[PDB]
Coordinates of C-alpha atoms and ligand atoms in Angstrom, one line a residue:
Chain A
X1 CA 14.7 152.3 45.2
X2 CA 14.5 155.9 43.9
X3 CA 17.7 157.0 45.7
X4 CA 19.4 155.2 42.8
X5 CA 17.3 156.6 40.0
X6 CA 18.2 160.1 41.4
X7 CA 21.8 159.2 42.0
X8 CA 21.9 158.1 38.3
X9 CA 20.5 161.3 36.8
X10 CA 22.9 163.2 39.0
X11 CA 25.9 161.0 38.3
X12 CA 25.3 161.7 34.6
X13 CA 24.7 165.5 34.7
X14 CA 27.6 166.0 37.1
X15 CA 30.0 164.6 34.4
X16 CA 28.9 167.2 31.9
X17 CA 29.0 170.1 34.4
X18 CA 30.4 171.3 37.8
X19 CA 27.2 172.7 39.2
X20 CA 23.6 171.5 39.1
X21 CA 20.5 173.1 40.4
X22 CA 17.9 171.0 42.3
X23 CA 15.0 172.5 40.3
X24 CA 16.7 171.3 37.1
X25 CA 17.3 167.7 38.2
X26 CA 13.6 167.5 39.0
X27 CA 12.9 169.0 35.6
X28 CA 14.5 166.0 33.9
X29 CA 12.0 163.5 35.1
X30 CA 8.8 164.6 33.2
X31 CA 4.7 167.9 44.2
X32 CA 4.8 164.3 45.6
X33 CA 7.8 164.2 43.3
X34 CA 9.4 167.4 44.5
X35 CA 9.4 166.2 48.1
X36 CA 10.5 162.7 47.0
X37 CA 13.5 164.1 45.2
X38 CA 14.2 166.5 48.0
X39 CA 14.6 163.6 50.4
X40 CA 16.8 161.7 47.8
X41 CA 19.3 164.6 47.8
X42 CA 19.4 164.8 51.6
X43 CA 19.9 161.1 51.7
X44 CA 22.7 161.3 49.1
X45 CA 24.4 164.2 50.8
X46 CA 24.4 162.3 54.1
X47 CA 25.9 159.2 52.5
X48 CA 28.6 161.6 51.1
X49 CA 27.9 161.2 47.4
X50 CA 26.9 164.8 46.9
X51 CA 27.5 168.3 48.0
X52 CA 24.7 170.7 48.9
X53 CA 24.6 174.5 49.3
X54 CA 21.9 177.1 49.5
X55 CA 22.3 180.9 49.8
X56 CA 18.9 182.2 50.9
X57 CA 15.8 181.0 52.7
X58 CA 14.0 179.2 49.9
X59 CA 16.5 179.9 47.2
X60 CA 18.2 177.6 44.8
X61 CA 19.9 174.4 46.0
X62 CA 23.3 173.9 44.3
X63 CA 24.3 170.3 43.9
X64 CA 28.0 169.4 43.3
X65 CA 29.4 165.9 43.1
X66 CA 31.9 164.2 45.3
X67 CA 34.3 161.4 44.4
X68 CA 31.9 158.9 46.0
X69 CA 29.1 159.6 43.6
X70 CA 31.0 157.3 41.3
Chain B
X1 CA 1.6 184.2 66.8
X2 CA 4.0 182.1 64.6
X3 CA 7.4 180.6 64.8
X4 CA 9.0 182.3 61.9
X5 CA 12.4 180.8 62.3
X6 CA 15.3 179.6 64.4
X7 CA 19.0 180.2 64.8
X8 CA 21.3 177.6 66.4
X9 CA 24.8 178.0 67.6
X10 CA 26.7 174.8 68.3
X11 CA 23.4 173.4 69.5
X12 CA 23.8 169.7 69.3
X13 CA 24.8 168.2 66.0
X14 CA 24.4 171.7 64.5
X15 CA 28.0 172.9 64.7
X16 CA 28.6 176.6 64.1
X17 CA 25.7 178.9 63.2
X18 CA 22.5 177.5 61.5
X19 CA 19.6 179.4 60.3
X20 CA 16.2 177.7 59.8
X21 CA 13.5 179.6 58.0
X22 CA 9.9 178.3 58.1
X23 CA 8.7 181.1 55.8
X24 CA 5.0 181.5 55.8
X25 CA 4.4 177.8 56.0
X26 CA 1.7 176.8 58.5
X27 CA 2.5 173.1 57.9
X28 CA 6.2 172.4 57.7
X29 CA 7.8 168.9 57.7
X30 CA 11.3 168.4 58.9
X31 CA 12.6 165.5 56.8
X32 CA 15.9 163.7 56.4
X33 CA 17.5 160.3 56.8
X34 CA 18.0 158.5 60.1
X35 CA 20.6 160.2 62.4
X36 CA 20.7 163.4 60.3
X37 CA 19.5 165.5 63.2
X38 CA 15.8 166.1 63.0
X39 CA 14.9 165.5 66.6
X40 CA 17.9 167.6 67.7
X41 CA 16.1 170.4 65.8
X42 CA 13.0 169.8 68.0
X43 CA 15.3 169.6 71.0
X44 CA 16.3 173.2 70.0
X45 CA 12.8 174.4 69.9
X46 CA 11.9 172.9 73.2
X47 CA 15.1 174.4 74.6
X48 CA 14.5 178.0 73.7
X49 CA 11.0 177.8 75.2
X50 CA 12.1 176.6 78.6
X51 CA 10.8 173.1 79.1
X52 CA 12.5 170.4 81.2
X53 CA 11.1 167.0 80.2
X54 CA 22.3 170.2 80.1
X55 CA 25.9 170.9 78.9
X56 CA 25.2 167.7 76.9
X57 CA 23.5 170.0 74.4
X58 CA 26.4 172.2 73.3
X59 CA 28.1 170.8 70.1
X60 CA 31.0 168.3 70.4
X61 CA 33.7 167.7 67.8
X62 CA 33.0 175.4 71.8
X63 CA 32.2 176.4 75.4
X64 CA 28.6 177.7 75.0
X65 CA 25.6 177.1 72.8
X66 CA 22.6 179.2 72.1
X67 CA 19.3 179.0 70.3
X68 CA 17.1 181.9 69.0
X69 CA 13.5 181.7 68.0
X70 CA 11.8 184.4 66.0
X71 CA 8.2 184.7 67.2
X72 CA 5.6 186.8 65.4
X73 CA 3.7 188.7 68.1
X74 CA 1.4 190.9 66.1
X75 CA 3.3 193.6 64.0
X76 CA 6.5 193.1 65.8
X77 CA 8.9 190.1 65.4
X78 CA 10.1 189.0 68.9
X79 CA 13.5 187.4 69.3
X80 CA 13.6 184.7 72.1
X81 CA 17.1 183.6 73.0
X82 CA 18.5 181.1 75.5
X83 CA 22.1 180.2 76.2
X84 CA 24.0 177.4 78.0
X85 CA 27.5 177.7 79.1
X86 CA 29.6 174.6 79.7
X87 CA 29.1 175.0 83.5
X88 CA 25.3 174.6 83.1
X89 CA 24.3 178.2 83.6
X90 CA 21.5 179.2 81.4
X91 CA 20.4 182.7 80.6
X92 CA 17.4 184.1 78.8
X93 CA 16.9 187.1 76.6
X94 CA 14.1 188.9 74.8
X95 CA 14.8 191.2 71.9
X96 CA 18.4 191.2 73.0
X97 CA 17.8 192.3 76.6
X98 CA 18.5 189.7 79.3
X99 CA 15.6 188.7 81.5
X100 CA 14.6 186.2 84.2
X101 CA 13.0 182.8 83.7
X102 CA 9.8 184.2 85.4
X103 CA 9.5 187.1 82.9
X104 CA 10.3 184.6 80.2
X105 CA 7.8 181.9 81.3
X106 CA 5.1 184.6 81.4
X107 CA 5.8 186.0 78.0
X108 CA 5.3 182.5 76.6
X109 CA 2.6 181.5 79.1
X110 CA 0.7 184.5 77.7
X111 CA 0.9 183.4 74.1
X112 CA -0.5 180.1 75.2
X113 CA 2.8 178.2 75.2
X114 CA 2.6 176.3 78.4
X115 CA 6.0 174.8 78.7
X116 CA 4.6 173.3 81.9
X117 CA 2.1 171.0 80.3
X118 CA 4.3 170.5 77.2
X119 CA 0.9 169.6 75.6
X120 CA 2.1 171.1 72.3
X121 CA 5.3 169.1 71.9
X122 CA 5.1 165.4 71.2
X123 CA 8.7 164.0 71.4
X124 CA 9.8 161.0 69.4
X125 CA 8.4 157.7 70.6
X126 CA 5.9 159.4 73.0
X127 CA 2.7 159.8 71.0
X128 CA 1.0 156.6 72.1
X129 CA 1.4 157.4 75.8
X130 CA -0.9 160.4 75.6
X131 CA -3.6 157.8 75.3
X132 CA -2.1 154.9 77.1
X133 CA -1.2 156.9 80.2
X134 CA -3.1 156.0 83.4
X135 CA -6.3 157.8 84.5
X136 CA -4.4 159.3 87.4
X137 CA -1.8 160.6 85.0
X138 CA -4.4 161.9 82.6
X139 CA -6.0 163.7 85.5
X140 CA -2.6 165.1 86.5
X141 CA -2.2 166.5 83.0
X142 CA -5.7 168.1 83.0
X143 CA -4.7 169.6 86.3
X144 CA -1.5 170.7 84.6
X145 CA -3.1 172.1 81.5
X146 CA -5.9 174.0 83.2
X147 CA -3.6 175.4 85.9
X148 CA -5.5 173.8 88.7
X149 CA -2.2 172.2 89.8
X150 CA -1.2 175.4 91.5
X151 CA -3.9 175.1 94.3
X152 CA -2.6 171.6 94.7
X153 CA -0.1 172.5 97.5
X154 CA -2.3 174.8 99.6
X155 CA -5.2 172.4 99.2
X156 CA -3.0 169.7 100.6
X157 CA -1.8 171.8 103.6
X158 CA -5.4 172.9 104.6
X159 CA -6.6 169.3 103.8
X160 CA -4.3 167.9 106.5
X161 CA -5.0 170.4 109.3
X162 CA -8.5 169.0 109.6
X163 CA -13.0 178.4 110.5
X164 CA -9.9 177.0 108.8
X165 CA -12.4 175.1 106.6
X166 CA -13.6 178.2 104.7
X167 CA -10.0 178.6 103.5
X168 CA -10.3 175.0 102.3
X169 CA -13.7 175.3 100.5
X170 CA -12.6 178.6 99.0
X171 CA -9.5 177.0 97.5
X172 CA -11.3 173.8 96.6
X173 CA -13.8 175.9 94.6
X174 CA -10.9 177.3 92.6
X175 CA -8.9 174.1 92.0
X176 CA -12.2 172.5 90.9
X177 CA -13.6 175.3 88.8
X178 CA -10.3 175.9 87.1
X179 CA -10.0 172.2 86.4
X180 CA -13.5 172.1 85.0
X181 CA -13.0 175.2 82.9
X182 CA -10.6 173.2 80.9
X183 CA -11.9 169.6 81.2
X184 CA -15.5 170.5 80.1
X185 CA -14.3 172.2 76.9
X186 CA -12.0 169.4 76.1
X187 CA -14.6 166.8 76.7
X188 CA -17.2 168.6 74.5
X189 CA -14.8 168.8 71.5
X190 CA -13.1 165.4 71.9
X191 CA -15.6 163.3 70.0
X192 CA -15.8 165.5 66.9
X193 CA -12.0 165.4 66.6
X194 CA -11.8 161.7 67.1
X195 CA -14.4 161.2 64.4
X196 CA -12.6 163.4 62.0
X197 CA -9.4 161.4 62.5
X198 CA -11.5 158.4 61.5
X199 CA -15.6 156.6 65.3
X200 CA -16.3 157.4 68.9
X201 CA -14.3 158.8 71.9
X202 CA -15.1 160.1 75.4
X203 CA -13.6 161.2 78.8
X204 CA -15.0 160.2 82.1
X205 CA -14.4 161.8 85.6
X206 CA -14.1 159.2 88.4
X207 CA -14.2 161.3 91.6
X208 CA -17.1 163.6 90.6
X209 CA -16.8 165.8 93.7
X210 CA -13.0 166.2 93.4
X211 CA -12.1 165.1 89.9
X212 CA -8.4 166.1 90.5
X213 CA -8.1 163.4 93.2
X214 CA -8.7 160.5 90.9
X215 CA -8.4 159.2 87.3
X216 CA -9.9 160.5 84.1
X217 CA -10.9 157.4 82.0
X218 CA -10.3 158.0 78.3
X219 CA -12.3 155.8 76.0
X220 CA -11.8 155.5 72.3
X221 CA -13.6 153.1 69.9
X222 CA -12.1 152.9 66.4
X223 CA -14.9 152.8 63.8
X224 CA -15.8 149.3 62.5
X225 CA -15.0 147.9 66.0
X226 CA -16.5 148.0 69.4
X227 CA -14.4 148.1 72.6
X228 CA -13.3 151.0 74.8
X229 CA -10.4 150.2 77.1
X230 CA -7.1 151.5 75.6
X231 CA -5.8 148.0 76.4
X232 CA -7.6 146.6 73.4
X233 CA -6.5 149.2 70.8
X234 CA -3.6 148.3 68.5
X235 CA -0.5 150.5 68.0
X236 CA -1.9 152.4 65.0
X237 CA -5.3 152.6 66.8
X238 CA -3.7 153.9 70.0
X239 CA -1.8 156.5 68.0
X240 CA -4.9 157.9 66.4
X241 CA -6.7 157.9 69.7
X242 CA -3.7 159.8 71.2
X243 CA -3.5 162.4 68.5
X244 CA -7.2 163.0 69.0
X245 CA -6.8 163.5 72.8
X246 CA -3.7 165.6 72.1
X247 CA -5.7 167.9 69.8
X248 CA -8.8 168.0 72.0
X249 CA -6.8 169.1 75.0
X250 CA -5.1 171.8 73.1
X251 CA -8.4 173.1 71.8
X252 CA -9.1 175.0 75.0
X253 CA -6.3 177.5 75.1
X254 CA -4.8 176.9 71.6
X255 CA -1.0 176.9 71.5
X256 CA 0.2 178.8 68.3
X257 CA 2.1 175.7 67.1
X258 CA 2.7 172.0 67.4
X259 CA 6.0 170.2 67.0
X260 CA 5.2 166.5 66.4
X261 CA 8.2 164.2 66.0
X262 CA 7.5 160.8 64.5
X263 CA 3.8 160.7 65.5
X264 CA 3.0 158.6 62.4
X265 CA 5.5 155.7 63.0
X266 CA 2.8 153.2 63.8
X267 CA 0.3 154.2 61.2
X268 CA -1.3 152.7 58.1
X269 CA -0.9 154.4 54.8
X270 CA -4.6 155.2 55.2
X271 CA -4.1 156.6 58.7
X272 CA -1.1 158.6 57.7
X273 CA -3.4 160.1 55.1
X274 CA -6.0 161.0 57.7
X275 CA -3.6 162.7 60.0
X276 CA -2.0 164.6 57.1
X277 CA -5.6 165.5 55.9
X278 CA -6.4 166.8 59.4
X279 CA -3.2 168.8 59.7
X280 CA -3.7 170.4 56.3
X281 CA -7.4 171.0 56.9
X282 CA -6.7 172.8 60.2
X283 CA -3.4 174.5 59.7
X284 CA -3.6 178.3 59.3
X285 CA -1.8 181.5 60.4
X286 CA -2.9 180.9 64.0
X287 CA -2.2 177.2 64.2
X288 CA 1.1 176.1 62.7
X289 CA 2.2 172.5 62.5
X290 CA 5.9 171.5 62.5
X291 CA 6.1 167.8 61.8
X292 CA 9.1 165.4 61.7
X293 CA 8.2 162.4 59.4
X294 CA 10.1 159.8 57.5
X295 CA 6.9 159.1 55.4
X296 CA 6.3 160.8 52.0
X297 CA 2.6 160.2 52.6
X298 CA 3.0 162.7 55.4
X299 CA 5.4 165.4 54.1
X300 CA 4.1 165.4 50.5
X301 CA 1.1 167.4 51.8
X302 CA 3.3 170.1 53.5
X303 CA 3.4 173.7 52.7
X304 CA 7.2 173.7 53.0
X305 CA 10.0 171.4 53.9
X306 CA 13.0 171.7 56.2
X307 CA 15.5 169.1 54.9
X308 CA 18.2 168.0 57.3
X309 CA 21.3 166.2 56.2
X310 CA 24.8 165.4 57.5
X311 CA 28.1 166.7 56.2
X312 CA 30.4 164.0 57.5
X313 CA 33.7 165.9 56.9
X314 CA 32.5 168.8 58.9
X315 CA 30.7 166.4 61.3
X316 CA 27.6 168.6 61.5
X317 CA 23.9 168.7 60.5
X318 CA 22.9 171.1 57.8
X319 CA 19.8 172.7 56.5
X320 CA 18.2 173.4 53.1
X321 CA 14.7 174.5 52.6
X322 CA 12.1 174.0 49.9
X323 CA 8.6 175.5 49.3
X324 CA 6.1 172.9 48.1
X325 CA 3.2 175.4 47.8
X326 CA 4.3 175.8 44.1
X327 CA 4.4 172.2 43.0
Ligands
AGS1 N1 26.2 167.2 71.4 C1 26.3 166.6 70.1 N2 27.3 166.9 69.3 C2 27.4 166.4 68.0 N3 26.6 165.5 67.4 C3 25.5 165.2 68.3 C4 25.3 165.7 69.6 N4 24.2 165.1 70.2 C5 23.8 164.3 69.2 N5 24.5 164.3 68.0 C6 24.3 163.6 66.7 O1 23.0 163.7 66.3 C7 22.5 162.4 66.0 C8 21.0 162.3 66.4 O2 20.3 163.2 65.7 P1 18.7 163.2 65.8 O3 18.3 164.6 65.8 O4 18.2 162.2 66.7 O5 18.5 162.6 64.3 P2 17.1 162.1 63.7 O6 17.1 162.7 62.4 O7 16.1 162.5 64.6 O8 17.1 160.5 63.5 P3 15.8 159.5 63.6 O9 15.1 159.8 64.9 O10 16.6 158.2 63.7 S1 14.6 159.6 62.3 C9 23.4 161.4 66.5 O11 23.6 160.4 65.5 C10 24.7 162.1 66.9 O12 25.9 161.7 66.2
MG2 MG1 14.9 161.3 66.1

């Protein structure tokens, strides 16, 4: 289950900062991986553990934490 | 042409205003968890295009909902819009100016989007049927895709009456030639496509003189095996046979894009790979593939991704996009 490995890296980083960019979270793990992580966020946002926001078409995805992430 | 993007307004689970940009992707996968609202997104595409496979659309905690599609017709970017009021009254618009469903249907019918045949939209859970349908049904579809179905009424009227016979031969010659104009092409390209998705497949007319008055027997034989009746094929086998027919039939008057829901649900990891390979290998500015898959094997190979997620507080689906052509 990778939705936990991703929840972990985010649960950490979101305790040392308010905002986190998707590209960065991927960064700290080293294309099949980008998509894999992308789904993980979407999953997490749906469960309610995370917040998502994007400004432009294919711009940056801002990830913020929610009380449930913990 | 290409489907550049969409704009939904209280469409289904898409409360408020939602913008979806496909960018220059010619292979986009709409991914997200169960219940997030991916199929609703396809329901929106089929909705703007006409298609009747109503107030039950419109979001539910507004009085009307609308969907806009930004089609790329040459240099210009056309805006196709459709609205539904809570009473059921729909309205169509093109580039902002209201129009009739006839003018609308034609615009699309001219860009090869036959909302009649729906042969470019495979809804969730329906892929295997394209193969498993009955010969009579397959025939009906051919009649529907070629256009030969039009002469169906008149042909029946004049058929019953029995110099009134020349009016019957004249029309028979059209229903038949129009039907063959499509069938022949499809038949000729069917086997190559099936083999690529692998193999051997074929179509067979039953009533040779009047093919439209009988079944069309579809035969597919997965590789290392040897049978022909769809009855013997397994779920994954039936799926692949279906995707081949689906693509063969569209090869005649190529729709500009496909919207496939969970077509890969019954597939091997090997087979998911072949479909993904095929899609990637054939996608291009003229043939765009919008796929909804839960499988990484599938969406990994995409050009871009449209991620759908829920936002429980706000009780609405949401969208975020990612371009995979970089990774
Ligand atoms: N009129 C509506 N108003 C608000 N929410 C709606 C409406 N119609 C449907 N929904 C919601 O949308 C969900 C269905 O979304 P779909 O588009 O089927 O999701 P999905 O991502 O396709 O899921 P699968 O097929 O299981 S992978 C349901 O769970 C509903 O709660
Ligand atoms: Mg669905």
